[PDB]
Amino acid sequence: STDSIVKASNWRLVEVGRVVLIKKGQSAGKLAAIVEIIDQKKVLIDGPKAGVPRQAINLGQVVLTPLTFALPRGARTATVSKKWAAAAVCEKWAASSWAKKIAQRERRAALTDFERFQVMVLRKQKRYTVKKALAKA
Amino acid sequence: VEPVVVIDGKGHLVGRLASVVAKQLLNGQKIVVVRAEELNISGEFFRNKLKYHDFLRKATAFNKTRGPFHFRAPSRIFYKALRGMVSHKTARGKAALERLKVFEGIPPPYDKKKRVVVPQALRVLRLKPGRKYTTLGKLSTSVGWKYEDVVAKLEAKRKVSSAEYYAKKRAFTKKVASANATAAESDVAKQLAALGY
Amino acid sequence: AESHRLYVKGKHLSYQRSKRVNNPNVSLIKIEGVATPQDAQFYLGKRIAYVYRASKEVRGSKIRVMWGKVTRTHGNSGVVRATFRNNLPAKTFGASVRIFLYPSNI
Amino acid sequence: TKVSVEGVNVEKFNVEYFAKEEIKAERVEDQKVVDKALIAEIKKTPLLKQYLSASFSLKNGDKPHMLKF
Amino acid sequence: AHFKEYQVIGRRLPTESVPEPKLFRMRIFASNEVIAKSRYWYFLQKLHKVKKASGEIVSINQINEAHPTKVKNFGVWVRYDSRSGTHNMYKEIRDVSRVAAVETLYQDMAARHRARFRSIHILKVAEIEKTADVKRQYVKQFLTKDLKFPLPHRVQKSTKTFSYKRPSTF
RNA sequence: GCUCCACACAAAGAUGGAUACGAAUAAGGCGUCCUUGUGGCGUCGCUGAACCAUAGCAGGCUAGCAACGGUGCACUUGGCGGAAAGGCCUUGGGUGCUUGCUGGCGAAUUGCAAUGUCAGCGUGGGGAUAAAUCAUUUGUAUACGACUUAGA
RNA sequence: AGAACUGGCGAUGCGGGAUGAACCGAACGUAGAGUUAAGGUGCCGGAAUACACGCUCACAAAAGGUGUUAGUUCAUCUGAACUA
Number of domains in chain B: 2
CA E50 to chain centre: 26
Strands (E), C1-106: 8-17, 22-31, 48-53, 63-66, 72-74, 79-82, 96-99
Calculate the angstrom distance between C1' of F145 and CA of A125: 82
Multiple choice CATH, C1-106, 3.40.50.300, 3.10.105.10, 1.10.420.10, 2.40.10.190: 2.40.10.190
Q: Is the CB of C58 under 7 A from strand G?
A: no
Q: Does D67 touch chain C (CB under 8 A)?
A: no
Residues B102 and B120 in one domain: yes
Structural domains of chain E sorted by starting position, each given as residue range(s) with its CATH number in brackets? 1-68 (3.10.20.10), 69-145 (3.10.20.10)
Pairwise CA distance, residues E162 & C35, whole Å:
13
Distance measured from the CA of protein residue A135 to the C1' of nucleotide F47, in angstroms: 32
Residue E25's H or E segment, with its range, is strand E24-30
User: What nucleotides of chain G have any atom within 7 angstroms of a protein Cβ?
Assistant: 15-17, 32-34, 42-55, 57, 69-73, 83-84
- How is B149-187 classified by DSSP, letter by letter? HHHHHHHHHHHHHHHHHHHHHHHHHHHHHHHHHHHSSSH
**From residue B97, how far is each of B93, B127, B136, C89 by CA, in Å?**
6, 28, 22, 21
CA distance B34 to B118: 13
Distance E79 CA to G70 C1' (A): 15
Same domain assignment for residues B115 and B188: no
Nucleic strand G contact set for A 66-125 (CB, < 7 Å): none
Cα(B8)–Cα(B116) distance, integer angstroms:
6
Q: What is the resolution of this structure in A?
A: 3.7
Clarify whether residues B86 and B177 are in a common domain: no
Residue E121: its H or E element:
strand E121-127
After what residue numbers is chain B broken, C–N > 2.5 angstroms? none
Assess contact for C98 and C51: CB atoms under 8 A.
yes
Extended beta strands in B86-135, E state: 100-101, 133-135
How many residue contacts between B and C have a Cβ separation below 8 Å? 12
Q: Does the CB of E136 sit below 7 A from strand G?
A: yes
- In the chain, the amino acid numbered E109 is M
Q: Are B77 and B152 within one domain?
A: no
Q: What is the dihedral sign for C-alpha A10, A11, A15, A16?
A: positive
List of residues 6+ apart from E110 with CB closer than 8 A:
E116
Question: Any CB–CB contact under 8 A between B96 and chain E?
Answer: no
**Does residue B128 sit in the same domain as residue B44?**
yes
Alpha carbon distance B24, B7 (integer Å): 12
Q: In this structure, are B177 and B109 located in the same domain?
A: no
CATH number of the domain at A58, please: 2.30.30.30
Shared domain for B3 and B67, answered yes or no, is yes
User: Strand pairing of B100-101 and B30-34?
Assistant: parallel
What length does chain D have?
69
d(CA A49, CA E65): 25
Quickly list H helices, A28-111: 77-87, 89-95, 97-109
Separation between Cα atoms, residue C98 and residue C92, nearest integer Å: 13
SS3 E13: coil
E90 strand G contact, CB < 7 Å:
yes
Among the listed residues B28, B29, B149, the one whose alpha carbon sits nearest the alpha carbon of residue B92 = B28
Contact (Cβ atoms closer than 8 angstroms) between residue C78 and residue C39: yes
Nearest to B136 by CA among B38, B16, B10: B38
Question: Is the shortest CB-to-strand distance from B33 to strand F under 7 Å?
Answer: no
- For A78, the domain range is 13-95
Q: What is the CA radius of gyration of chain B?
A: 22
Question: What contacts D9, CB < 8 A, 6 or more positions away?
Answer: D33, D34
The method of structure determination was cryo-EM
Same domain, residue pair B88 and B157: no
**Alpha-carbon span B155 to D38, nearest angstrom:** 66
C91-96, long-range: CB < 8 A, 24+ apart: C92/C12, C92/C50, C92/C52, C93/B26, C93/B28, C93/B92, C93/C12, C93/C13, C93/C14, C94/B26, C94/B27, C94/B28, C94/C11, C94/C12, C94/C13, C95/B28, C95/C11, C95/C12, C95/C50, C95/C52, C96/C9, C96/C10, C96/C11, C96/C12
A53: which DSSP letter? P
Cα–Cα distance for residue pair A26/B5, rounded to 1 Å: 37
Per-residue DSSP letter, A54 = P
The whole-angstrom separation of Cα E33 and Cα E41 is: 13
CB distance C36 to B33 below 8 Å: no
3-state helix, strand, coil in chain B (%, to 5): 50, 10, 40
Strand G–CB B87 distance below 7 A: yes
Chain breaks after residues in chain D, where C lies over 2.5 Å from next N? 21
Q: Based on the domain organization, do B164 and B178 belong to the same domain? A: yes
Instruction: Using CB atoms, pick whichever of A104, A107, A134 lies closest to residue B179.
Output: A134
Provide φ and ψ at C32, rounded to 5°: -85, 120
CA nearest B46: which of B134, B131, B136, B148?
B134
First to last CA, chain B: 24
Q: Which domain holds residue B181?
A: 148-197
B1: chain C residues, CB-CB within 8 Å: 32
- Strand-strand pairing, C22-31 and A13-14: unpaired
The spacing between the Cα labelled CA in B141 and the C1' in F79, in angstroms, equals 39
Q: Does one domain contain both B56 and B93? A: yes
CATH no. for residue B166?
1.20.5.4280
Last residue in a domain, options B105, B125, B147: B147
**Which residues numbered 8-37 in D keep a CB inside 8 Å of some CB on A?**
none
**Domains of chain C by residue range:** 1-106
Q: Which helix (H) or strand (E) holds E95?
A: strand E89-95
Do B106 and B161 reside in the same domain of the chain?
A: no
Mapped onto helix, strand or coil, the DSSP state of residue E62 is strand
User: Looking at the DSSP assignment, which residues form a beta bridge with residue E72?
Assistant: E95
Kindly state whether residues B170 and B115 are assigned to the same domain.
Answer: no
